[PDB]
Amino acid sequence: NLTAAESRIRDVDMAKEMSEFTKNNILSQASQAMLAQANQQPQNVLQLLR
Amino acid sequence: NLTAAESRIRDVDMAKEMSEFTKNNILSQASQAMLAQANQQPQNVLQLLR
């Protein structure tokens, strides 16, 4: 019972923590896409310059 | 928020500042046209002289 309790504290629902892992990766890479699109506006400003 | 605020102070609405750039150029060159026409009256005075 105490090894069970310790486990419920210390251990990980590694299935759930993997779904979370995936999720955080997708959020990172999505933010990276938003960065890629974000760095495209000043060039349009340059098109306006010439 | 503070980089945003600094930017709102320091930076330029470079689109607007370009429309302004264009505008000031056209006013300059227009004044130059008015100079070109302005230097044509004394010659008519000379035509009156002879």
Experiment used for this model: cryo-EM
Angle made by CA atoms A6, A12, A17, in degrees to the nearest 5 = 165
CA gap B19, B9 in Å, rounded: 19
Q: Are B14 and A45 in contact (CB under 8 A)?
A: yes
Resolution of the model in angstroms:
4.3
**Best mutation target, B7, B14, B16, to test chain A (most A CBs within 10 A):** B14
Q: Which of B4, B18, B1 shows the shortest CA–CA distance to A44?
A: B18
| Cβ neighbours, 10 Å, residue A20 | 13
Q: Which residues contact A46 (CB under 8 A, 6 or more apart)?
A: none
CA gap A17, A5 in Å, rounded: 19
Please report the beta strands in A1-50, taking only residues with DSSP state E, as ranges in sequence order: none
| A49 interface with B at CB cutoff 8 Å | yes
Residue that has been written with the tokens 């419920």 in this structure: A8
| CB interface of B with A, residues 11-40, below 8 Å | 14-15, 18
Give contacts of B17 with chain A, Cβ < 8 Å. Answer: none
Copy the structure tokens of residue B44: 């008519």
